[model samples]
Target: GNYTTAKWQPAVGTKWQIELLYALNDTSVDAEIYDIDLFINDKSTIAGLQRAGRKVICYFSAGSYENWRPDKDKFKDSDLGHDLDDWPGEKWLNISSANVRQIMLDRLDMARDKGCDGVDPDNVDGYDNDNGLDLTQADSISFVNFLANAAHARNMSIGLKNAGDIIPSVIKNMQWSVNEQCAQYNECDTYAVFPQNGKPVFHIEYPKGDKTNNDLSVTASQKNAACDFAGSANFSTVIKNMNLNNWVEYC
Candidate 1:
């Protein structure tokens, strides 16, 4: 179906939620967008959010292989690359593989069918890590552009996820960004260009560090670092657990 957007447009300073590990019954987070797991959520849940006037940004791994997904069998072993460090059961994907692209396209179709207003495609920066796919930065750029074009064709917007190296080449084709630990890595400046270009950067930071699993409060400096990001004054930053459940502190 070639459904076009119905007055849909995401601007530079959009407020959003990035919850993927749980079923969020509360959509009244006072945020404009709710980024939820596409596979975990049913059509009724997504429809309920939109009926209540909140835009839903369905999330799915576009550049990685998660063994737990329902479509796990669809991906051949050739599509699987190296395992993500410290992340068990998750592996990088050969983004250059036509099979992987087809899987992503099917996911996009699912997003549109689920009544989602947009999509938060994750793991798009396969080129930035030891992906084992030899996926180039250009592959990331082309992949993101393909996603954006496909989403637009379905009237569902797509966002770039922490691929700062390809931002210069792909920002013009994206609706927003989903960055993690940019402040911790001192790469905030590398991605601030999105907000500068009138696109929001839905930034996230694990202030509690990688090993902390509980809801431990962050220190003043930890808060300051993620909030007062060097060149990301315009970003909408959120502090969350690495698990990305319902726990969140925004600044």
Candidate 2:
């Protein structure tokens, strides 16, 4: 089935909120876009946000399989690979597998069914990790494009998630770039290309380290370190807890 390209493109510095811990209970963040868990959030929740004029970007792992997901059993043993570091029950996926691609296609269908304006597929940088499958950058590029074509066909946009190495190859297919800690790592310059291309970089920084400080805002120095980095002027930056709760401080 043929479909047109994705039409929902967000510009640079678009305000957004990302809460993947659980179902979203707070809609008072005043953000233009909300990135939430695709499975955890139901259709009504996504529709409510859309009714309020906010775009919702559904998040799912395209490169890793989480044992807790509803479709966990859909993945075959051969589709699973190395366990992600510090992330128990989550393992890298064999992107080359037809089953894995089918699962992702189902996920994109779910995103469209839930009325998501776009999607944020994470862990595409498996080549940079200790993936036992020996996934390469080329494999990731191909996988990302496959997912991108499917997403665009659904009329739902998709973004590149932290896979900076393949940004140049896949940016044309991406609606935005969801970055993590680019400012802290001095890599914002690389991600600045998204904003430079007139697309938003929905960047996140975990200044509070491993502590899930949901109630406490980051200190002035922490905030400065996360927000004042060079080449981040056009990026939509947010200071978030590592657990990605409702706590967020924007710069």
Q: Highest lDDT, which number? A: 2
**Per-residue lDDT of model 2, residues 1-251, tens digit only:** 22236899888888999999989999999999999999999999999999999999999999999999999999999998888986659999999999999999999999999899999999999999999999999999999999999999889999999989998888888889999988778788888888888999999999888866676777899898988877677889888889988888888
| Residue 106 displacement in candidate 2 (angstroms) | 0.6
How close is each model in CA RMSD to the real structure? 2.8, 1.9
Instruction: Give the alpha-carbon lDDT of every model.
Output: 0.84, 0.91
Taking all chains together, each candidate's TM-score versus the true structure is 0.92, 0.97
* lDDT for each residue of candidate 1 in 208-241, tens digit (9 for 90 to 100): 8777767667888889888895666688888889
Give stretches of model 2 more than 4 Å off: 1-4, 86-88
